[PDB]
Amino acid sequence: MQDAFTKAIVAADLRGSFLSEQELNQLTNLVKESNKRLDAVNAITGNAAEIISDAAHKLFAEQTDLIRPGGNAYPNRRMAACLRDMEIILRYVSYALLAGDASVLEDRCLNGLKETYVALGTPTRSVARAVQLMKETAIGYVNSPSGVTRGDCSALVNEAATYFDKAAASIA
Amino acid sequence: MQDAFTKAIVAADLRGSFLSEQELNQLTNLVKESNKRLDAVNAITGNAAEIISDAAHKLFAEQTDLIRPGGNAYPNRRMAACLRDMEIILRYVSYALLAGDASVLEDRCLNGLKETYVALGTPTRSVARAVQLMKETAIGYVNSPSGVTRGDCSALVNEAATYFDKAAASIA
Amino acid sequence: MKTVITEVIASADSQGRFLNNTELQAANGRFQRATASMEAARALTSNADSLVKGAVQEVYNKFPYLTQPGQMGYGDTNQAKCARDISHYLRFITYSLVAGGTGPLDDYIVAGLREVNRTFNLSPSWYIEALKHIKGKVGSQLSGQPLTEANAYIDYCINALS
Amino acid sequence: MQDAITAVINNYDVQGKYLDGAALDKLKAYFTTGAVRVRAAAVISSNATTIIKEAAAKALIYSDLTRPGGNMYTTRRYAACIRDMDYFLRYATYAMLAGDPSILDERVLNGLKETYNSLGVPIAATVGGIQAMKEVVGGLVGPDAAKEASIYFDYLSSGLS
Amino acid sequence: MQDAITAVINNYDVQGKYLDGAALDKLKAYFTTGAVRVRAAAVISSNATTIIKEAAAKALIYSDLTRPGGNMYTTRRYAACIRDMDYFLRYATYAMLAGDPSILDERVLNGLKETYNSLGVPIAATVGGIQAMKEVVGGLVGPDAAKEASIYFDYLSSGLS
Amino acid sequence: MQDAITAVINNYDVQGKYLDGAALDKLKAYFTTGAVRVRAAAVISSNATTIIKEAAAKALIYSDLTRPGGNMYTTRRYAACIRDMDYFLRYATYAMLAGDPSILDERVLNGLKETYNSLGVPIAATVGGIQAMKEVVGGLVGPDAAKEASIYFDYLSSGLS
Amino acid sequence: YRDRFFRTASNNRFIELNFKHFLGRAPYSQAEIGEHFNRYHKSGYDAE
Amino acid sequence: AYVQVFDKDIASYIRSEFSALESRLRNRETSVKEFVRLLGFSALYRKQFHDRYPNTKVVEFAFKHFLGRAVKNQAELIKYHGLLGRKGIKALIGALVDGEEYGRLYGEDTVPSWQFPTLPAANYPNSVELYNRFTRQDDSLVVPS
Amino acid sequence: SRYFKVTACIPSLKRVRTGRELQNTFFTKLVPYENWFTEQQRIQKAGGKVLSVKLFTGVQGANTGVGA
Amino acid sequence: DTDRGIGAQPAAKLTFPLSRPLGVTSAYFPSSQGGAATSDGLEMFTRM
Amino acid sequence: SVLTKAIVNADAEARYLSPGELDRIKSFVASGERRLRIAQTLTEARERIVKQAGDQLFQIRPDVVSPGGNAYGEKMTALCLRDLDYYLRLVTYGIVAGDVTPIEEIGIIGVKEMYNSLQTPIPAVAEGVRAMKNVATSLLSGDDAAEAGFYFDYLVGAMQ
Amino acid sequence: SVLTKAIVNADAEARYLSPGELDRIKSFVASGERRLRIAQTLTEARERIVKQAGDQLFQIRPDVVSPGGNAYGEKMTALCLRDLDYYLRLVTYGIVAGDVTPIEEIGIIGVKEMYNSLQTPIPAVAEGVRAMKNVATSLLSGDDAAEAGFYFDYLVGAMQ
Numbered sequence A, B: 001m002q003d004a005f006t007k008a009i010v011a012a013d014l015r016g017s018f019l020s021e022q023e024l025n026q027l028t029n030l031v032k033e034s035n036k037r038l039d040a041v042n043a044i045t046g047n048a049a050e051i052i053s054d055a056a057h058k059l060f061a062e063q064t065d066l067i068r069p070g071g072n073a074y075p076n077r078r079m080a081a082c083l084r085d086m087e088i089i090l091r092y093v094s095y096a097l098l099a100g101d102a103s104v105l106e107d108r109c110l111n112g113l114k115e116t117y118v119a120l121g122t123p124t125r126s127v128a129r130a131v132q133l134m135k136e137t138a139i140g141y142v143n144s145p146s147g148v149t150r151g152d153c154s155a156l157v158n159e160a161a162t163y164f165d166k167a168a169a170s171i172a
Numbered sequence C: 001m002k003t004v005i006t007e008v009i010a011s012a013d014s015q016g017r018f019l020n021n022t023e024l025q026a027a028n029g030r031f032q033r034a035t036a037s038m039e040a041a042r043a044l045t046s047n048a049d050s051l052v053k054g055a056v057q058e059v060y061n062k063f064p065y066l067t068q069p070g071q072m073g074y075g076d077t078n079q080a081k082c083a084r085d086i087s088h089y090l091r092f093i094t095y096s097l098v099a100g101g102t103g104p105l106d107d108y109i110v111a112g113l114r115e116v117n118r119t120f121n122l123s124p125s126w127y128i129e130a131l132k133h134i135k136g137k138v139g140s141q142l143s144g145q146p147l148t149e150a151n152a153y154i155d156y157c158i159n160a161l162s
Numbered sequence D, E, F: 001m002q003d004a005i006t007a008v009i010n011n012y013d014v015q016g017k018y019l020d021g022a023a024l025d026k027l028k029a030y031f032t033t034g035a036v037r038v039r040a041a042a043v044i045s046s047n048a049t050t051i052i053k054e055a056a057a058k059a060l061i062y063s064d065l066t067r068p069g070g071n072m073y074t075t076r077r078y079a080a081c082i083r084d085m086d087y088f089l090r091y092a093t094y095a096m097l098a099g100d101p102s103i104l105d106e107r108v109l110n111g112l113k114e115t116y117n118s119l120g121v122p123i124a125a126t127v128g129g130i131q132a133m134k135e136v137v138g139g140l141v142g143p144d145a146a147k148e149a150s151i152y153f154d155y156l157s158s159g160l161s
Numbered sequence G: 001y002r003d004r005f006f007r008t009a010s011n012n013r014f015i016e017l018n019f020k021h022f023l024g025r026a027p028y029s030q031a032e033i034g035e036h037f038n039r040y041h042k043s044g045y046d047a048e
Numbered sequence H: 001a002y003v004q005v006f007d008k009d010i011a012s013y014i015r016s017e018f019s020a021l022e023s024r025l026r027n028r029e030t031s032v033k034e035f036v037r038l039l040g041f042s043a044l045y046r047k048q049f050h051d052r053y054p055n056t057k058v059v060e061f062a063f064k065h066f067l068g069r070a071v072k073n074q075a076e077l078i079k080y081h082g083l084l085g086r087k088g089i090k091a092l093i094g095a096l097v098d099g100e101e102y103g104r105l106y107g108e109d110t111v112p113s114w115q116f117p118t119l120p121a122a123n124y125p126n127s128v129e130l131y132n133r134f135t136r137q138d139d140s141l142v143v144p145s
Numbered sequence I: 001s002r003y004f005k006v007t008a009c010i011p012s013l014k015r016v017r018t019g020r021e022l023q024n025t026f027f028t029k030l031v032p033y034e035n036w037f038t039e040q041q042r043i044q045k046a047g048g049k050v051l052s053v054k055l056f057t058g059v060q061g062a063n064t065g066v067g068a
Numbered sequence J: 001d002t003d004r005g006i007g008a009q010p011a012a013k014l015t016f017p018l019s020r021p022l023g024v025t026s027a028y029f030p031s032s033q034g035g036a037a038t039s040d041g042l043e044m045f046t047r048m
Numbered sequence K, L: 001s002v003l004t005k006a007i008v009n010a011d012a013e014a015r016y017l018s019p020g021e022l023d024r025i026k027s028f029v030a031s032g033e034r035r036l037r038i039a040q041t042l043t044e045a046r047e048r049i050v051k052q053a054g055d056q057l058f059q060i061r062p063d064v065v066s067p068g069g070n071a072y073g074e075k076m077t078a079l080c081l082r083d084l085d086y087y088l089r090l091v092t093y094g095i096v097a098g099d100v101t102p103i104e105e106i107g108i109i110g111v112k113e114m115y116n117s118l119q120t121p122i123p124a125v126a127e128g129v130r131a132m133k134n135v136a137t138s139l140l141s142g143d144d145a146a147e148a149g150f151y152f153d154y155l156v157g158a159m160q
């Protein structure tokens, strides 16, 4: 598994070199913003259930076919599987966010996922949408939390978004 | 696994409605003929060994190449495998016959079977024939048993045949 | 889907033997029992409409507050999705009655029930009370072994929710 | 031509009667079997060529009929015969959809017995070609539709004999 | 001819593309207006004769056109003119159902301008006969359908001028 | 149409000349090649389908022409194109038997250039389809007939370009 | 074991290998993968 | 031309359905042959002379409405009746009208007509039988084969 | 569905003729797509020039709707 | 079964194999040929 | 019917039914019970429906029932309502068939010639039919009233 | 479409649409979203479908992919699956149109002549289509699988 430092190290090694002063300071900056990062990961963990629930309510509000017989979130067994997948993806997105690298998300979650869903008959476009809704709400929470020191978290909100967007793209 | 009732239920559910008095009475009739069905399954169970043996004797009577060196029912190991497969298929045909549905036969036994045999070099046309012979003898027994009440079992004899014919078709 | 026939067939397959007497005897039970089961099924089927409206209302009468604004028994959509859900339960009860086992209930309502109800803030108590009411009224639509069958499956749902 | 439904309408029209309970019961008896007729037609249509080939194989070829002196000798006449077979299959499928044999009389049987007498076409052999296609059809369409398809093949064959 | 739906299918077929999101959105935009098109056609069809009579009354007759020297003088030519009017109304109803004007080009406009020049048929007067029928139609069919019916009358009339 | 024997007669008739020595020499030059023309026609006719198949394979298919956006895309247009090919082959065989290209003008080339411009049919691609059939023909018919068959394929192809 | 197969395989892929390494056979059915994946979701890796 | 195709009895009832066709003929847009052809492709033709008869009487009726006679020999029934079996009415009609025989006999304008033919054997009496039967008088096939 | 509009001039080469006949020899008319073609042959096989052909009804590209 | 080449490890092999359908060579007319097979009434009797 | 129409087009092109043709037979037959209910309701109120069409007609055209009117008198009016009873019957037939084949052969093809002979004003017969639509339609649910209304407007259309 | 077919019959008889014709347009358009979903699912799995059809085909006919077979070799097989991709595409078109007009002009009229020239065995193309039915049908609900299945069986029918 990689994190943002480990990634630097692998690229340096492929040159046969000690880390460039370029790469050093990029990593010094990651340490600089790490308290904000911890709050951002904490924002997701602290509202995981609601993020999934709210995404869910809204997914089925839009796509009332999934909860009809014939639909891929019917009966209870399938809805529980769908709720479970929402959690799994939100979980690996939070891991990537602590790590500063998408690899854990791509390697343990996204790799093969689309082909799984197609084999199953699970509508990937609906799954992509559920991921887009989790993103909206998750970032909502990253941006408006309990008595965190005021500052600018937009860099981290972007990065979180790209992890949500990776997952969506990979699946649709 | 499905039986004839379970099949009805799955189709009803896909409509999102209850039994269509149509389906109810089709199932009432299956209950009506169920004593005959039990005798038919019992006919096969009670003569399983002879059904396999007699099919076998006749298969090798016709295809004396299988029992020559170079042949797929030579030496003892291969003959035992062939005798075993005859039993396995007769088994799943009897299960389908108790169930009133082919699914257990198709899902556990027939699914992939042809491609197995081709990988192995087992001549599928000979296997199909062994199944045709089991059918002849099995139905023989369904039709002429020990002190069963006299009546008409042709509907059940047909249905048993289609299970034998499914297997044959699937394999050849 | 768990039923008498299916279960015995599965047993046979696992054992890799043959449909013997034990199995045949067991299967006869399921066949002999079909008449009572299917009478319960027909009665529950034609009364479905009112059994559902009766139980839906009873959820509001037992939990009055549900029907106030800001609550989950308010507005057309909640009350619509409720009727639907009880209708799902009665539907699977009839299926279980016709099928000769709990399979339809196990596969389509029990597997996953709590996770779903917990994510969506649905209290089992409502559903138990819907079913307790349905059980009260089914006392006078059926009797004898059809009633016992209806009861068996209604109670199975109540125990499943608990 | 007429189908189940227009058979009833015209039977009442000549009496100038509005449709009554007996009429309405007949029409229901048709509508209630309708979906099954459609599925059966889609099986027959899509297996048309295979049904003719299996019916010819069981009831016509490998015989004196296909040999010199036989009526389906020559590629010309072999082609005409299986062409005919396709007509029968296709029209029987119409009759079964309509739930009325009237089309088999209007567009197939009328004059056909004498047409075959005039050309020398063997009637008994043609009936076997009809009853062999029925046999194949009844396997392919299943319990739902077997009896209903079958009758219009039987209508065709007692129309020639 | 083509309609909304086949317009899209043929546009993709020439590129050999399966229907994509943009295509599927277009087809939805047609299906979602479909029920309203049907109701509008039933109003036009059943008021056909009254629409022509009110359109002629506002835009053609009581004039030099119907007097000696005029193109709709003689019962022959008056009949030919309101015959034409019925074509326009009827085809515009087809175009509006199809949600595509292609039928108005293929079966109505092609060569018609020159046909009218060759016979002496007054073009401007015919356009007014078209735009008067539109006026009547838009009242009869209501808010739901007014704009959609109207465009194919406007297609017809800029096709002549 | 005209053929070598007929052309000699009409070319002299307009001058009112008996056939004279020069005329008689021309007709001999035709008769003396006649048996070879017949043999060549029997080869072409009996290999018709294979010539089209090999000519299409070398000069038309496996290309953008047969892909979406191409003029021989769709089974409809592929069928129309090899239908055309058969015309060319068949008529060139007539011209070569007659020993006169006049039939290729009267019944094939007249208006065809503009017909192809109007439909969008690619002219250069069609010429290659002609010159590929010539190539195949010249192998099949042999030394005796190769040059004589070839010219009427060349007549066809400079008639389009 | 964890590192080599679970960490970088999707669930589907990961589930195939346990059938190979642990029972010496391929998953017989589509449902069989469903059950395992689900059990992972509630009980976590160790239970699976 | 409605009495040649359609035949008299049912041509009395035509009122104005073919009126767009008539305008085109009147205006010289189509020739008499186009009009005749197009009135064979219409649903009225099809209803009257095709839907109630066996496919071999459809060929016979069509021979006498678009050509004047009855089928001459047997190598014809076979040709034309096996083009109706294969492709339906509009190909059968389209073929008769574009034949060499129709072109020689009728040309571009000349409404078709009953010719009492003299040659091949039996063509004359077969044709005269067809000609002198009112609509629905007898619907046997005269020339079955 | 598509229609061609064609001009044809066909002379009479056997017999002359005696009564007006002018529309039977040089005419123009709409002709359907399915025939226009096998009538293109009948005209050229009777020794007649075909003067001009125009599409009239359909679109040059095609693909769909044509078949009607 | 190892991931060193990419590191990630392959996408699950059996998803498409797992879902391939039943398949209905329906109708189906059996065959007696084969060799010529007895027909007649005599079969029982000879035996008797 | 829908069946007859689909088939006739099939046979005339020498072919099996299209997916489209099969679909409409399926949608049609699904509406069977509903169509039968629409015919029943109207059959059940036939005498009322004619009486209210007949009142609506004579207000709008008191002349038809006037000295020089086709329906002037007690028995010239009796036959007029009988004709209105005929057309309501045909409308019930059409609704259960799902098209006009039956309605058409029985009561529109030849209707111009019949009524011209009798000197009956055709357009006031069309009015009598509109009047029946209004009454019949007030005894049917919105959805069923529309489905019925198409067949009334057809007859009104054919007398034109 | 259903629209094109209805209209062409209307115009050819010089008339407005029938109650029947209007009804089928209404039932058809009501199934719009469903038909669009059926096409989407199949479009979404096209590469898988075309491939499982191709395996089912080569087991049943290993000869086509044999010395004297039309599809023998890697690029004679590549073109064969491409043709299977073509027909699946046309099947999605047909399903959203509700009839075959488009399917027919694009890929059956002329198909005998095309494949006879290429010497492709037509009946084994029909098998490739059955194989696609089997795969596609396993990715659709019972009701949608049947609706799709009609269009697969049509193509199978037309290659005959």
Ligand SMILES: CCC1=C(C)/C(=C/C2=NC(=C\c3[nH]c(/C=C4\NC(=O)[C@H](C)[C@H]4CC)c(C)c3CCC(=O)O)/C(CCC(=O)O)=C2C)NC1=O
Binding pocket: A059, A066, A071, A072, A073, A074, A078, A079, A081, A082, A085, A088, A108, A109, A110, A113, A116, A117, A120, A121, A122, A123, A124, A125, A126, A127, A128, A130, G010, G011, G012, G033, G034, G035, G037, G038
């Ligand atoms: C690697 C991490 C991972 C992912 C992403 C994953 C996806 C996944 N989703 C599945 C099923 C499913 N997925 C859904 C999802 C949906 N249904 C809808 O209608 C919506 C559009 C959508 C929710 C937004 C449904 C309904 C099923 C059950 C399908 C069925 O069994 O019929 C299955 C089949 C096994 C099972 O049901 O447990 C897998 C493997 N599995 C994994 O291990």
Ligand SMILES: CCC1=C(C)/C(=C/C2=NC(=C\c3[nH]c(/C=C4\NC(=O)[C@H](C)[C@H]4CC)c(C)c3CCC(=O)O)/C(CCC(=O)O)=C2C)NC1=O
Binding pocket: A032, A033, A035, A036, A037, A038, A039, A040, A042, A142, A143, A144, A145, A148, A149, A150, A151, A152, A153, A156
């Ligand atoms: C238990 C693990 C752990 C956490 C969670 C942690 C959080 C943490 N967040 C901090 C700051 C902060 N955190 C944020 C975060 C935000 N500002 C906003 O306006 C946004 C709503 C939000 C975006 C994510 C900001 C702006 C600061 C002050 C600047 C900084 O220290 O970088 C600080 C520095 C002290 C302070 O200023 O309060 C700590 C220790 N430390 C830890 O050891």
Ligand SMILES: CCC1=C(C)/C(=C/C2=NC(=C\c3[nH]c(/C=C4\NC(=O)[C@H](C)[C@H]4CC)c(C)c3CCC(=O)O)/C(CCC(=O)O)=C2C)NC1=O
Binding pocket: B032, B033, B035, B036, B037, B038, B039, B040, B042, B142, B143, B144, B145, B148, B149, B150, B151, B152, B153, B156, C021, C024, C025, C028
């Ligand atoms: C231990 C499991 C079990 C079995 C096996 C069982 C058999 C059983 N078979 C029965 C009848 C019968 N069984 C048959 C069967 C046949 N008739 C023939 O001529 C054929 C040779 C054969 C075809 C399969 C018939 C005809 C009847 C009488 C009709 C009926 O009850 O349906 C009956 C009704 C009582 C009777 O009439 O004897 C029972 C209880 N019951 C059971 O609980």
Ligand SMILES: CCC1=C(C)/C(=C/C2=NC(=C\c3[nH]c(/C=C4\NC(=O)[C@H](C)[C@H]4CC)c(C)c3CCC(=O)O)/C(CCC(=O)O)=C2C)NC1=O
Binding pocket: A057, A060, A067, A073, A074, A075, A076, A079, C056, C059, C066, C072, C073, C074, C077, C078, C079, C081, C082, C083, C085, C086, C088, C089, C108, C109, C116, C120, C122, C126, C127, C130
């Ligand atoms: C196949 C078997 C099956 C069952 C049993 C089932 C239950 C079920 N009930 C749900 C929602 C619901 N269930 C209710 C229930 C009620 N509201 C009330 O007025 C009453 C208090 C109560 C009825 C007693 C409500 C209000 C919702 C909407 C929850 C939401 O989305 O906020 C949902 C979420 C998806 C949706 O919004 O439809 C499921 C899956 N789903 C199934 O597929």
Ligand SMILES: CCC1=C(C)/C(=C/C2=NC(=C\c3[nH]c(/C=C4\NC(=O)[C@H](C)[C@H]4CC)c(C)c3CCC(=O)O)/C(CCC(=O)O)=C2C)NC1=O
Binding pocket: D061, D062, D063, D066, D072, D073, D074, D075
């Ligand atoms: C005199 C005019 C005439 C001909 C030619 C004719 C041919 C003919 N060939 C047949 C079969 C056959 N013909 C062949 C021929 C071939 N298989 C191949 O792959 C090769 C391409 C080809 C050999 C060169 C085969 C294999 C069959 C058996 C097909 C079957 O039984 O399905 C049959 C059916 C069997 C029968 O009843 O006789 C006929 C009638 N019949 C006639 O009246």
Ligand SMILES: CCC1=C(C)/C(=C/C2=NC(=C\c3[nH]c(/C=C4\NC(=O)[C@H](C)[C@H]4CC)c(C)c3CCC(=O)O)/C(CCC(=O)O)=C2C)NC1=O
Binding pocket: E061, E062, E063, E066, E072, E073, E074, E075
């Ligand atoms: C020279 C050939 C020729 C004729 C005959 C002809 C008649 C004709 N009569 C008209 C109206 C009319 N014609 C009448 C006639 C009558 N009302 C009755 O009830 C009686 C039966 C009848 C008098 C005997 C009436 C009342 C109108 C007015 C109708 C209206 O405005 O709606 C109009 C429309 C008004 C106009 O623009 O002129 C024309 C064109 N036009 C022609 O080019």
Ligand SMILES: CCC1=C(C)/C(=C/C2=NC(=C\c3[nH]c(/C=C4\NC(=O)[C@H](C)[C@H]4CC)c(C)c3CCC(=O)O)/C(CCC(=O)O)=C2C)NC1=O
Binding pocket: F061, F062, F063, F066, F067, F072, F073, F074, F075, F078, L064, L069, L070, L071, L072, L076, L077, L079, L080, L081, L083, L084, L086, L087, L106, L107, L118, L120, L121, L122, L124, L125, L128
């Ligand atoms: C959308 C309408 C449409 C279709 C369907 C179509 C098919 C088509 N198939 C072709 C070849 C081919 N098609 C196949 C197909 C097969 N081989 C077999 O044995 C099997 C029976 C079958 C696969 C299921 C093969 C093997 C070729 C190569 C033949 C050759 O090159 O001679 C070619 C020539 C190659 C090219 O230029 O593209 C065309 C145009 N073209 C069209 O415009």
Ligand SMILES: CCC1=C(C)/C(=C/C2=NC(=C\c3[nH]c(/C=C4\NC(=O)[C@H](C)[C@H]4CC)c(C)c3CCC(=O)O)/C(CCC(=O)O)=C2C)NC1=O
Binding pocket: F060, F065, F070, F071, F072, F077, F078, F080, F081, F082, F084, F085, F087, F088, F107, F108, F115, F119, F121, F122, F123, F125, F126, F129, I037, I040, I041, I062
């Ligand atoms: C008897 C003498 C004679 C000739 C030669 C003839 C040619 C001819 N080719 C045509 C169309 C055509 N011709 C082609 C030909 C080709 N497509 C290509 O891409 C290739 C370059 C080429 C084949 C090598 C095609 C594709 C069409 C159809 C155009 C359309 O879709 O409308 C048409 C239009 C009518 C129709 O579609 O049948 C005519 C008349 N007609 C005649 O009467």
Ligand SMILES: CCC1=C(C)/C(=C/C2=NC(=C\c3[nH]c(/C=C4\NC(=O)[C@H](C)[C@H]4CC)c(C)c3CCC(=O)O)/C(CCC(=O)O)=C2C)NC1=O
Binding pocket: E060, E065, E070, E071, E072, E077, E078, E080, E081, E082, E084, E085, E087, E088, E107, E108, E115, E119, E121, E122, E123, E125, E126, E129, H020, H022, H023, H024, H026, H027
């Ligand atoms: C199916 C599509 C179609 C259309 C639209 C059509 C129009 C059309 N209008 C025509 C004549 C005509 N059109 C009119 C029309 C009018 N007179 C006026 O003064 C007004 C301005 C106008 C009516 C609003 C008249 C008066 C004639 C007769 C010209 C003559 O006497 O020759 C003709 C000549 C043949 C005939 O007389 O019937 C055609 C073909 N033909 C078609 O096939």
Ligand SMILES: CCC1=C(C)/C(=C/C2=NC(=C\c3[nH]c(/C=C4\NC(=O)[C@H](C)[C@H]4CC)c(C)c3CCC(=O)O)/C(CCC(=O)O)=C2C)NC1=O
Binding pocket: D060, D065, D070, D071, D072, D077, D078, D080, D081, D082, D084, D085, D087, D088, D107, D108, D115, D119, D121, D122, D123, D125, D126, D129, H054, H055, H056, H077, H078, H081, H082, H145
């Ligand atoms: C649309 C309804 C319809 C039918 C059914 C029909 C039948 C029919 N069959 C015919 C001939 C024939 N029919 C057959 C049939 C057979 N030969 C045999 O030996 C078998 C017993 C049998 C096939 C199973 C043959 C061989 C001929 C040709 C007779 C001849 O050589 O003239 C002919 C004479 C014209 C022709 O040859 O096409 C007709 C009209 N025509 C119709 O319009």
